Amino acid sequence: DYSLEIDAVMKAAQINDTNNFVQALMRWHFSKETGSPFWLGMREQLNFDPIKDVKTINDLRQFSDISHCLRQEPVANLVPQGLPADSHPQVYESGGTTGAPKYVVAYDAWIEALISWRMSRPSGNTLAAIPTGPHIVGAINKERALRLGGMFFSIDIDPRWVKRSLSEGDTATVRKYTHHLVDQVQNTLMNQDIRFLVTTPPVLRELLKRPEVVLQMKQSLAQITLGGTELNLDEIKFIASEILPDCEFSASYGSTSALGVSRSLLITSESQQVIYDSFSPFITYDVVDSITAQTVEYGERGNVIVTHLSPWAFYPRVAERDTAIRLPGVSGFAGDRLADIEPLK
Amino acid sequence: KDYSLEIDAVMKAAQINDTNNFVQALMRWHFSKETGSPFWLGMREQLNFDPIKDVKTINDLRQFSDISHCLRQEPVANLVPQGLPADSHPQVYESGGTTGAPKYVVAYDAWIEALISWRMSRPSGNTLAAIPTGPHIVGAINKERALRLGGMFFSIDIDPRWVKRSLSEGDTATVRKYTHHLVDQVQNTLMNQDIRFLVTTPPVLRELLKRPEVVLQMKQSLAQITLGGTELNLDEIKFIASEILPDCEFSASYGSTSALGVSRSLLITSESQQVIYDSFSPFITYDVVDSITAQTVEYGERGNVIVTHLSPWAFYPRVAERDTAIRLPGVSGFAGDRLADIEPLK
């Protein structure tokens, strides 16, 4: 039982004592008693001592991205021994397009913590027009739908097929697929009482072209969440002021890599950027030059780098496929904020 | 206000096959103002019979009609019996999108747990269930199974509504490309992670078997394959079982959202002459009836499949499924028929 070791970590996180948070978690991840087989075995490959040479969150820059290992690392090797036996490990995936994907493990207690943080009033049912299956977004949105006093409704949506279909410029399929998505979404909006919608711009765009659906949304929806990295802020502002005046808008930024999502500020008439905040110190961002990997200045755009550190997992310095404008983090908190995320070309 | 004892009493009656007291107790449950669902509470007054006084046995449920149409716009909260505890965890699942869309039902963790302890009744490891998740209860049922097998639950992106849409526009080129895309995700997992159990469908297996490196991996690591759906080809399965995957066991799964469950077949071997299924009786019961008279057929005759779900969680009587099957004797002491060689109607 390592419930005291664990709770001491969470208490360091809570008071933002990030140095002790980091050091306590280095000891956790690299003890023979509590660490995961994967990090225990990785320790000999490192050019420094994770226990002697890591004092702060910046010291984590000594680690390389090990995402490339997560194809063939057996998933059970990702589990820290120190976790309780009822922790409930679950496989989730991102990648690859062509052959991949990377396999990570999340736990209920983690998704629970993440949603607590996110969630700190309307109530009702949620329609998440998002991937489930191997995609952690699916499980994160279930847990949020549960905090919202309703049921979790979803659709069939094969995001890999949509990716693959673009990479082949078969945009005839892509049109037809989105169409089928939107039909699913219409069905539930019409037939059941949905308070909360979670979707993407292309899907919402085509929904707003179906006027009966539009009328239902005027009556029922208290909030729309938009996900992804292809958000047109002007389009959203308009939708919000002219078309769905009673519905709140916000954005969600997915990182499977950090086992998480990040929340935007509410999107108002006043919004100059979409600006995202992370579950720091568990999930932290850095925004870096694409050649030097050095942190850019505030207001500059660089490559997004995400680090997960927690009792459940350790994924240091993950190089995402996105860029953002670097903003100062919430004060007393490790990590940067992001604005206006874009995909890399 | 707490109904733990009542619920337990029902479970106990099912446990010991006291089917009469099980049915009678669940009529009270479902039709009492205190414990029943708003949906059946509201339906009571259009029945031509008293579900409480005029129903004694399973066969007596024949007096109910299939209400499956109401489930498209019945608000889902209305399906929730008021007597369930507050921790119960209602979840929505769907059947019948693809022209036209979908019945919404509710299911609960404790129900799915009971169903899997039934189904589950040496090898252990990871499961790859190459099957729908999302709004589909089969995903959630397979997740709980995988949990009990001592490994993790791996899954894929698969949109069965897309597949049926395409198929009905007779667009076979899209069907094919999509199947290839499913097979790629399955191969990736089978090649990169150690998978002990595979849950899939014949079209997909059929293509996996066209990939010699994949077959070699399977020969090495697969303790069991489960095939779903209603287009099973016994002879082909027996071939793969004996000549291709000799150290792998094969079974079938027959799902219906209508009954919030799956039924399970006997191991398919060299000796099998039929694919034969049994159900989680008395919660899920089958009848096999004439297409015109709706009367039960003789053992060994083909008829239309009727499924009944009866539990503390739900009540779906006499659902007319879109499949036929050979009617077989049930397990002795159990209400309901066993089924063999399921086919879709048309």
XYZ file of C-alpha atoms in Angstrom:
691
model
C 0.000 0.000 0.000
C 1.572 3.256 -1.192
C -1.422 5.484 -0.527
C 0.726 7.740 1.601
C 3.457 8.096 -1.051
C 0.722 8.886 -3.651
C -1.243 11.310 -1.488
C 1.957 13.261 -0.643
C 2.427 13.752 -4.442
C -1.070 15.140 -4.925
C -0.507 17.489 -1.964
C 2.660 18.811 -3.582
C 0.733 19.364 -6.801
C -2.061 21.111 -4.974
C 0.280 23.611 -3.233
C 2.293 23.986 -6.484
C 5.474 22.823 -4.855
C 6.597 21.617 -8.281
C 10.170 20.818 -7.274
C 9.014 18.422 -4.600
C 6.307 17.153 -6.913
C 8.967 16.367 -9.547
C 11.402 14.824 -7.075
C 8.822 12.761 -5.324
C 7.672 11.439 -8.765
C 11.289 10.711 -9.882
C 11.600 8.523 -6.788
C 8.238 6.910 -7.523
C 8.967 6.215 -11.223
C 12.510 4.932 -10.618
C 12.236 2.842 -7.313
C 12.281 -0.901 -7.749
C 9.275 -1.081 -5.432
C 6.972 1.466 -7.052
C 8.158 2.219 -10.600
C 6.916 0.828 -13.865
C 8.956 -1.910 -15.569
C 9.346 0.371 -18.566
C 11.077 3.272 -16.704
C 13.080 0.866 -14.491
C 14.478 -0.700 -17.649
C 14.993 2.690 -19.319
C 17.035 4.029 -16.377
C 20.312 2.395 -17.523
C 20.001 4.020 -20.988
C 19.949 7.566 -19.497
C 22.912 9.939 -19.545
C 22.074 11.337 -16.094
C 20.561 10.179 -12.777
C 16.804 10.923 -12.691
C 17.051 10.991 -8.919
C 20.199 13.052 -8.395
C 20.133 15.275 -11.498
C 16.415 16.257 -11.573
C 15.281 18.928 -9.053
C 12.797 21.058 -10.999
C 10.325 20.850 -13.952
C 12.929 22.478 -16.249
C 15.406 19.627 -15.372
C 13.022 17.327 -17.198
C 14.400 18.749 -20.439
C 17.244 16.093 -19.946
C 14.713 13.436 -21.028
C 14.009 12.541 -24.589
C 10.632 11.812 -26.083
C 10.160 7.989 -25.904
C 6.944 7.949 -27.904
C 8.697 5.867 -30.598
C 9.002 3.017 -27.894
C 5.318 2.886 -27.237
C 4.497 0.815 -30.364
C 5.970 -2.428 -29.063
C 6.478 -1.867 -25.374
C 4.068 -4.296 -23.759
C 1.407 -2.134 -22.151
C 1.674 -3.884 -18.759
C 5.268 -2.576 -18.536
C 3.753 0.957 -18.412
C 2.002 0.213 -15.078
C 3.743 1.487 -11.901
C 4.018 -1.340 -9.343
C 3.113 1.207 -6.675
C -0.476 1.579 -7.827
C -3.330 -0.226 -5.907
C -4.663 -3.438 -7.520
C -8.062 -1.889 -8.186
C -6.526 0.948 -10.236
C -8.229 -0.354 -13.509
C -5.595 0.067 -16.363
C -7.013 0.775 -19.725
C -5.334 0.919 -23.125
C -5.597 4.023 -25.242
C -4.002 4.927 -28.610
C -2.770 7.684 -30.866
C -1.127 7.447 -34.301
C -0.020 6.479 -36.645
C -1.807 7.210 -39.946
C 0.386 4.641 -41.899
C 1.096 1.651 -39.520
C 1.470 2.558 -35.823
C -0.220 3.302 -33.150
C 1.367 4.177 -29.798
C -0.186 2.298 -26.836
C -0.550 4.069 -23.491
C -2.355 3.145 -20.253
C -4.759 5.436 -18.297
C -6.635 4.727 -14.958
C -9.969 5.826 -13.532
C -8.523 7.763 -10.614
C -6.537 9.825 -13.233
C -9.424 10.607 -15.542
C -11.394 11.434 -12.426
C -8.721 13.909 -11.213
C -8.459 15.455 -14.670
C -12.231 16.028 -14.849
C -12.308 17.451 -11.283
C -9.725 20.027 -12.343
C -11.514 20.779 -15.590
C -14.849 21.148 -13.918
C -13.969 23.387 -10.979
C -25.493 25.660 -13.810
C -27.247 23.774 -16.657
C -27.479 19.953 -16.304
C -28.631 17.257 -18.684
C -27.520 14.747 -21.324
C -24.373 15.063 -23.441
C -24.065 14.112 -27.145
C -20.361 13.506 -27.828
C -19.948 13.293 -31.503
C -16.323 12.116 -30.844
C -14.194 8.869 -31.235
C -14.511 6.261 -28.523
C -12.899 2.795 -29.012
C -9.097 3.189 -28.540
C -9.304 7.057 -28.110
C -8.979 8.425 -24.623
C -11.059 11.520 -25.538
C -13.996 9.139 -25.532
C -13.350 8.059 -21.889
C -12.619 11.657 -20.696
C -15.901 12.904 -22.169
C -17.883 10.033 -20.509
C -16.563 11.062 -17.125
C -17.477 14.712 -17.830
C -20.939 13.736 -19.093
C -21.408 11.889 -15.755
C -20.551 15.045 -13.695
C -23.187 16.888 -15.748
C -26.332 15.111 -14.464
C -27.191 13.299 -17.644
C -26.452 10.406 -19.888
C -23.596 10.012 -22.305
C -24.766 9.698 -25.927
C -22.299 9.055 -28.717
C -22.134 8.205 -32.408
C -20.097 5.971 -34.671
C -17.089 7.970 -35.867
C -13.981 6.407 -37.359
C -11.380 9.194 -37.172
C -8.640 7.041 -38.753
C -10.732 6.481 -41.824
C -11.234 10.265 -42.131
C -7.445 10.878 -41.730
C -6.556 8.114 -44.230
C -9.188 9.394 -46.644
C -7.524 12.865 -46.705
C -3.956 11.523 -47.083
C -5.327 9.974 -50.298
C -7.165 13.164 -51.366
C -10.338 11.121 -51.724
C -12.400 14.107 -50.554
C -15.524 12.578 -52.198
C -15.578 9.979 -49.361
C -14.702 12.634 -46.827
C -17.716 14.721 -47.908
C -19.996 11.607 -47.814
C -18.556 10.474 -44.409
C -19.104 13.820 -42.671
C -22.582 13.731 -44.078
C -23.174 10.374 -42.324
C -21.713 11.796 -39.136
C -24.085 14.747 -39.296
C -27.085 12.500 -39.926
C -26.219 10.593 -36.694
C -26.001 13.813 -34.750
C -29.277 15.130 -36.103
C -31.042 11.902 -35.060
C -30.092 12.260 -31.438
C -30.625 16.007 -31.206
C -34.157 15.432 -32.572
C -35.153 12.303 -30.711
C -33.624 12.837 -27.222
C -33.115 15.868 -24.981
C -29.470 16.906 -25.421
C -28.113 19.776 -23.192
C -24.380 19.472 -24.130
C -22.809 18.917 -27.553
C -19.173 17.968 -28.166
C -18.122 18.047 -31.778
C -15.746 19.643 -34.343
C -16.096 22.687 -36.818
C -16.625 20.696 -39.987
C -19.500 18.759 -38.295
C -21.158 21.740 -36.646
C -20.772 23.736 -39.946
C -23.031 21.227 -41.757
C -25.535 20.916 -38.904
C -26.260 24.648 -39.022
C -27.397 24.097 -42.677
C -30.394 21.959 -41.447
C -32.927 24.493 -40.134
C -35.132 22.092 -37.997
C -31.935 20.906 -36.277
C -31.039 24.564 -35.843
C -34.409 25.205 -34.129
C -33.976 22.273 -31.708
C -30.530 23.570 -30.776
C -31.993 26.983 -29.997
C -34.452 25.299 -27.554
C -32.145 22.647 -25.918
C -28.293 23.385 -26.006
C -26.632 25.151 -23.072
C -23.068 24.454 -24.307
C -21.056 23.469 -27.324
C -17.451 22.180 -27.023
C -15.289 22.281 -30.138
C -12.280 20.092 -30.413
C -9.223 19.875 -32.622
C -6.747 22.314 -34.022
C -8.676 23.663 -37.049
C -10.772 26.280 -35.225
C -11.764 29.516 -37.027
C -12.428 31.962 -34.166
C -14.421 34.351 -36.369
C -16.780 31.600 -37.466
C -17.397 30.603 -33.796
C -18.027 34.264 -32.634
C -20.642 34.746 -35.342
C -22.392 31.382 -34.577
C -22.483 32.386 -30.932
C -23.908 35.946 -31.342
C -26.280 35.505 -34.259
C -27.265 31.839 -34.373
C -27.019 30.188 -30.938
C -27.285 33.211 -28.613
C -28.160 31.100 -25.518
C -25.453 28.478 -25.988
C -21.981 28.875 -24.315
C -18.913 28.027 -26.529
C -15.521 26.683 -25.525
C -12.705 24.656 -27.083
C -11.009 21.414 -26.099
C -7.419 20.613 -26.995
C -6.686 16.819 -26.959
C -3.311 15.320 -25.962
C -3.454 11.452 -25.877
C 0.216 11.772 -25.336
C -0.254 13.370 -21.890
C -3.393 11.264 -21.174
C -5.386 14.504 -21.215
C -7.319 17.480 -22.575
C -6.825 21.191 -22.023
C -9.683 23.717 -21.556
C -10.120 27.036 -23.319
C -11.516 30.281 -21.945
C -15.149 30.801 -22.853
C -15.469 32.048 -26.435
C -17.206 35.492 -26.307
C -17.697 38.596 -28.560
C -14.656 39.940 -26.648
C -12.415 36.916 -27.671
C -9.216 37.886 -29.468
C -7.654 34.410 -29.179
C -8.646 30.864 -28.212
C -6.476 30.417 -25.138
C -5.930 27.062 -23.379
C -4.936 26.216 -19.828
C -3.546 22.718 -18.762
C -3.861 20.438 -15.702
C -0.549 21.671 -14.320
C 1.755 20.296 -12.753
C 0.487 16.868 -14.085
C 0.216 18.080 -17.668
C 2.610 20.969 -18.684
C 3.338 22.739 -22.042
C 6.465 24.228 -23.488
C 6.519 26.030 -26.830
C 9.789 25.713 -28.665
C 11.760 26.623 -31.750
C 11.489 23.812 -34.355
C 15.236 23.550 -34.868
C 16.796 24.466 -31.509
C 13.948 23.100 -29.281
C 14.438 26.213 -27.136
C 11.478 27.868 -25.551
C 10.247 30.819 -27.537
C 9.347 34.306 -26.164
C 5.774 35.007 -24.996
C 3.670 35.959 -27.998
C 5.811 33.920 -30.358
C 4.582 30.772 -32.103
C 6.535 27.501 -31.724
C 6.174 23.730 -31.618
C 4.027 22.279 -28.815
C 5.881 20.055 -26.291
C 3.775 18.210 -23.639
C 4.920 16.487 -20.435
C 2.772 14.148 -18.297
C 4.044 13.496 -14.796
C 1.807 11.814 -12.181
C 1.565 8.655 -10.012
C -0.003 6.910 -13.070
C 2.412 7.734 -15.866
C 5.539 9.612 -16.911
C 5.825 10.841 -20.545
C 8.490 13.530 -20.650
C 8.957 16.193 -23.418
C 6.539 14.765 -26.018
C 6.912 16.610 -29.343
C 3.365 17.129 -30.611
C 2.395 17.777 -34.225
C 1.030 21.284 -33.502
C 2.165 24.874 -33.032
C 0.880 27.511 -30.703
C 1.441 30.983 -29.425
C 3.158 30.817 -26.097
C 1.401 32.694 -23.239
C 2.379 33.034 -19.613
C 1.085 30.258 -17.435
C -1.502 30.849 -14.718
C 0.456 32.427 -11.876
C 2.234 30.097 -9.332
C 1.735 27.274 -11.876
C 4.309 25.313 -13.902
C 3.872 25.308 -17.623
C 2.753 27.670 -20.373
C -0.600 28.524 -21.843
C -1.348 28.092 -25.479
C -3.339 30.187 -27.954
C -4.508 29.562 -31.485
C -3.224 26.038 -32.004
C -2.538 25.030 -35.543
C -1.493 21.701 -37.052
C 1.970 21.311 -38.588
C 2.006 20.943 -42.484
C -37.107 3.505 -0.544
C -34.147 1.134 -0.665
C -34.891 -1.985 -2.773
C -31.668 -4.002 -2.357
C -33.595 -6.891 -0.837
C -36.203 -7.063 -3.496
C -33.510 -6.991 -6.186
C -31.476 -9.659 -4.441
C -34.587 -11.842 -4.108
C -35.056 -11.746 -7.892
C -31.420 -12.670 -8.539
C -31.768 -15.543 -6.054
C -34.910 -16.863 -7.766
C -33.107 -16.801 -11.139
C -30.018 -18.412 -9.598
C -32.138 -21.475 -8.551
C -34.439 -21.524 -11.616
C -37.553 -20.722 -9.715
C -38.789 -19.164 -12.950
C -42.396 -18.701 -11.906
C -41.518 -16.643 -8.821
C -38.851 -14.852 -10.824
C -41.415 -13.736 -13.438
C -44.111 -12.877 -10.870
C -41.738 -10.834 -8.759
C -40.510 -8.870 -11.787
C -44.114 -8.129 -12.850
C -44.589 -6.478 -9.431
C -41.208 -4.793 -9.822
C -41.913 -3.358 -13.246
C -45.556 -2.438 -12.683
C -45.459 -1.068 -9.133
C -45.679 2.724 -8.715
C -42.812 2.620 -6.298
C -40.264 0.668 -8.320
C -41.379 0.474 -11.980
C -40.153 2.561 -14.909
C -42.283 5.507 -16.119
C -42.476 3.803 -19.545
C -44.099 0.554 -18.333
C -46.022 2.437 -15.641
C -47.480 4.528 -18.476
C -48.133 1.447 -20.643
C -49.999 -0.577 -18.057
C -53.341 1.006 -18.939
C -53.184 0.076 -22.552
C -52.629 -3.636 -21.842
C -55.693 -5.997 -22.360
C -54.584 -7.932 -19.282
C -53.249 -7.387 -15.808
C -49.462 -8.056 -15.892
C -49.637 -8.616 -12.168
C -52.616 -11.015 -11.875
C -52.621 -12.625 -15.378
C -48.907 -13.502 -15.767
C -47.511 -16.549 -13.896
C -44.989 -18.093 -16.126
C -42.522 -17.187 -18.869
C -44.945 -18.472 -21.555
C -47.588 -16.114 -20.146
C -45.405 -13.171 -21.297
C -46.715 -14.101 -24.841
C -49.573 -11.756 -23.980
C -47.229 -8.739 -24.392
C -46.432 -7.248 -27.700
C -43.185 -6.082 -29.075
C -42.905 -2.353 -28.114
C -39.577 -1.808 -29.864
C -40.831 1.187 -32.015
C -41.435 3.321 -28.849
C -37.678 3.280 -28.130
C -36.776 5.813 -30.873
C -38.400 8.783 -28.934
C -39.236 7.435 -25.585
C -37.082 9.750 -23.446
C -34.353 7.405 -22.020
C -34.896 8.516 -18.379
C -38.338 6.933 -18.761
C -36.782 3.435 -19.124
C -35.133 3.667 -15.688
C -36.930 1.667 -12.946
C -37.382 3.925 -9.927
C -36.479 1.031 -7.602
C -32.778 0.773 -8.772
C -30.179 2.130 -6.224
C -28.572 5.621 -6.833
C -25.154 4.116 -7.565
C -26.587 2.133 -10.468
C -24.849 4.003 -13.432
C -27.365 4.124 -16.418
C -25.786 4.150 -19.791
C -27.371 4.569 -23.238
C -26.899 2.108 -26.059
C -28.534 2.035 -29.458
C -29.694 -0.321 -32.201
C -30.968 0.279 -35.804
C -29.441 3.453 -37.365
C -28.859 2.831 -41.121
C -32.310 3.601 -42.635
C -33.707 4.711 -40.367
C -32.295 5.705 -37.042
C -31.942 4.375 -33.822
C -33.730 2.692 -30.865
C -32.287 4.057 -27.504
C -32.103 1.748 -24.542
C -30.515 1.926 -21.091
C -28.176 -0.645 -19.505
C -26.272 -0.735 -16.232
C -22.869 -2.096 -15.052
C -24.422 -4.590 -12.619
C -26.499 -6.086 -15.410
C -23.385 -6.427 -17.637
C -21.463 -7.947 -14.742
C -24.182 -10.591 -14.140
C -24.234 -11.397 -17.907
C -20.437 -11.889 -18.056
C -20.321 -14.106 -14.907
C -22.915 -16.199 -16.696
C -20.952 -16.301 -20.007
C -17.688 -16.956 -18.240
C -19.140 -19.890 -16.430
C -6.441 -21.608 -18.150
C -5.382 -19.023 -20.793
C -5.363 -15.370 -19.798
C -4.128 -12.231 -21.473
C -5.014 -9.315 -23.685
C -8.117 -9.152 -25.797
C -8.459 -7.410 -29.149
C -12.119 -6.891 -29.796
C -12.280 -5.682 -33.365
C -15.933 -4.663 -32.938
C -18.025 -1.456 -32.571
C -17.886 0.584 -29.387
C -19.610 4.003 -29.154
C -23.438 3.568 -28.887
C -23.109 -0.234 -29.229
C -23.572 -2.459 -26.079
C -21.506 -5.303 -27.561
C -18.358 -3.118 -26.982
C -19.235 -2.639 -23.316
C -20.126 -6.333 -22.900
C -16.765 -7.305 -24.476
C -14.882 -4.833 -22.354
C -16.226 -6.527 -19.182
C -15.320 -9.996 -20.573
C -11.810 -8.937 -21.371
C -11.453 -7.614 -17.795
C -12.187 -11.101 -16.444
C -9.613 -12.701 -18.781
C -6.691 -11.033 -17.054
C -5.471 -8.528 -19.536
C -6.336 -5.348 -21.258
C -9.044 -4.587 -23.699
C -7.703 -3.480 -27.095
C -10.166 -2.234 -29.630
C -10.254 -0.539 -33.095
C -12.013 2.278 -34.954
C -14.941 0.601 -36.778
C -18.156 2.284 -37.921
C -20.705 -0.433 -38.598
C -23.342 2.168 -39.593
C -20.988 3.335 -42.344
C -20.593 -0.220 -43.515
C -24.391 -0.789 -43.725
C -24.971 2.607 -45.374
C -22.440 1.816 -48.132
C -23.732 -1.733 -48.623
C -27.313 -0.425 -49.100
C -26.225 2.132 -51.744
C -24.631 -1.031 -53.285
C -21.247 0.734 -53.203
C -19.006 -2.370 -52.901
C -15.702 -0.553 -53.596
C -16.125 1.485 -50.393
C -17.101 -1.674 -48.476
C -13.856 -3.271 -49.663
C -11.532 -0.369 -48.866
C -13.077 -0.002 -45.414
C -12.670 -3.738 -44.690
C -8.968 -3.343 -45.676
C -8.670 -0.372 -43.298
C -10.209 -2.567 -40.473
C -7.798 -5.399 -41.231
C -4.819 -2.966 -41.109
C -5.752 -1.795 -37.581
C -6.225 -5.419 -36.507
C -2.881 -6.475 -37.960
C -1.109 -3.540 -36.301
C -2.330 -4.579 -32.871
C -1.753 -8.308 -33.375
C 1.852 -7.505 -34.550
C 2.830 -4.879 -31.937
C 1.129 -6.249 -28.737
C 0.650 -9.745 -27.370
C -2.999 -10.640 -27.980
C -4.451 -13.856 -26.422
C -8.123 -13.411 -27.534
C -9.589 -12.057 -30.742
C -13.254 -11.003 -31.137
C -14.134 -10.394 -34.814
C -16.411 -11.219 -37.848
C -15.802 -13.670 -40.784
C -15.201 -10.958 -43.478
C -12.383 -9.511 -41.391
C -10.841 -12.822 -40.279
C -11.001 -13.952 -43.920
C -8.721 -11.090 -44.986
C -6.408 -11.403 -41.969
C -5.800 -14.993 -43.055
C -4.576 -13.676 -46.440
C -1.543 -12.164 -44.587
C 1.107 -14.861 -43.901
C 3.018 -12.832 -41.295
C -0.243 -12.219 -39.413
C -1.210 -15.935 -39.559
C 2.167 -16.829 -38.142
C 1.759 -14.420 -35.249
C -1.793 -15.809 -34.630
C -0.556 -19.411 -34.630
C 1.755 -18.324 -31.872
C -0.337 -16.243 -29.474
C -4.163 -16.763 -30.004
C -5.878 -18.985 -27.412
C -9.290 -18.078 -28.711
C -11.257 -16.441 -31.519
C -14.831 -15.339 -31.178
C -16.921 -14.659 -34.248
C -19.882 -12.387 -34.161
C -22.965 -11.844 -36.303
C -25.407 -13.895 -38.296
C -23.435 -14.796 -41.497
C -21.321 -17.617 -40.026
C -20.115 -20.364 -42.417
C -19.644 -23.465 -40.282
C -17.512 -25.395 -42.854
C -15.064 -22.541 -43.388
C -14.693 -22.100 -39.628
C -13.997 -25.827 -39.224
C -11.339 -25.627 -41.905
C -9.528 -22.664 -40.281
C -9.864 -24.357 -36.887
C -8.214 -27.562 -37.974
C -5.777 -26.634 -40.611
C -4.957 -22.971 -39.959
C -5.296 -22.257 -36.256
C -5.149 -25.754 -34.635
C -4.174 -24.476 -31.197
C -6.891 -21.770 -31.222
C -10.445 -22.365 -29.940
C -13.421 -20.931 -31.811
C -16.865 -19.913 -30.556
C -19.572 -17.706 -31.799
C -21.380 -14.752 -30.188
C -24.959 -13.788 -31.057
C -25.823 -10.347 -29.834
C -28.999 -8.411 -29.523
C -29.217 -4.964 -28.214
C -32.959 -5.676 -27.830
C -32.151 -8.157 -25.012
C -29.195 -6.023 -23.772
C -26.982 -9.094 -24.180
C -25.117 -11.774 -26.042
C -25.662 -15.557 -26.281
C -22.777 -17.935 -26.511
C -22.207 -20.975 -28.700
C -20.522 -24.323 -28.005
C -16.869 -24.505 -29.038
C -16.843 -25.039 -32.784
C -14.818 -28.227 -33.461
C -14.266 -30.943 -36.069
C -17.233 -32.747 -34.576
C -19.737 -29.710 -34.729
C -22.520 -30.040 -37.330
C -24.369 -26.847 -36.240
C -23.424 -23.636 -34.450
C -25.514 -23.935 -31.281
C -26.318 -21.086 -28.836
C -27.589 -20.844 -25.299
C -28.851 -17.758 -23.437
C -28.651 -16.191 -19.973
C -31.953 -17.689 -18.958
C -34.152 -16.656 -17.242
C -33.125 -12.971 -17.930
C -32.843 -13.594 -21.638
C -35.077 -16.184 -23.250
C -35.661 -17.289 -26.874
C -38.729 -18.591 -28.704
C -38.626 -19.550 -32.424
C -41.916 -19.092 -34.140
C -43.775 -19.446 -37.454
C -43.584 -16.226 -39.564
C -47.390 -16.096 -39.948
C -48.941 -17.711 -36.764
C -46.172 -16.593 -34.360
C -46.593 -20.065 -32.739
C -43.532 -21.912 -31.514
C -42.163 -24.412 -34.044
C -40.964 -27.973 -33.543
C -37.420 -28.713 -32.392
C -35.206 -28.958 -35.514
C -37.409 -26.606 -37.560
C -36.312 -23.105 -38.635
C -38.446 -20.159 -37.472
C -38.323 -16.463 -36.555
C -36.274 -15.550 -33.442
C -38.165 -13.885 -30.580
C -36.189 -12.580 -27.696
C -37.389 -11.547 -24.201
C -35.299 -9.590 -21.714
C -36.714 -9.740 -18.109
C -34.660 -8.331 -15.206
C -34.520 -5.808 -12.325
C -33.004 -3.440 -14.976
C -35.279 -3.680 -17.998
C -38.236 -5.450 -19.462
C -38.397 -6.071 -23.283
C -40.981 -8.653 -24.115
C -41.290 -10.780 -27.231
C -38.984 -8.736 -29.425
C -39.232 -9.912 -33.022
C -35.672 -10.133 -34.233
C -34.691 -9.858 -37.927
C -33.174 -13.384 -37.860
C -34.263 -17.023 -38.146
C -32.736 -19.973 -36.390
C -33.238 -23.681 -35.846
C -35.164 -24.283 -32.667
C -33.386 -26.512 -30.160
C -34.213 -27.870 -26.666
C -33.150 -25.495 -23.884
C -30.825 -26.435 -20.968
C -33.036 -28.726 -18.715
C -34.562 -26.805 -15.846
C -34.210 -23.494 -17.887
C -36.947 -21.570 -19.583
C -36.289 -20.771 -23.258
C -34.921 -22.499 -26.355
C -31.419 -22.970 -27.540
C -30.755 -21.780 -31.151
C -28.798 -23.085 -34.029
C -27.534 -21.679 -37.375
C -28.753 -18.163 -37.235
C -29.513 -16.448 -40.518
C -30.767 -12.930 -41.283
C -34.222 -12.622 -42.829
C -34.508 -11.723 -46.620
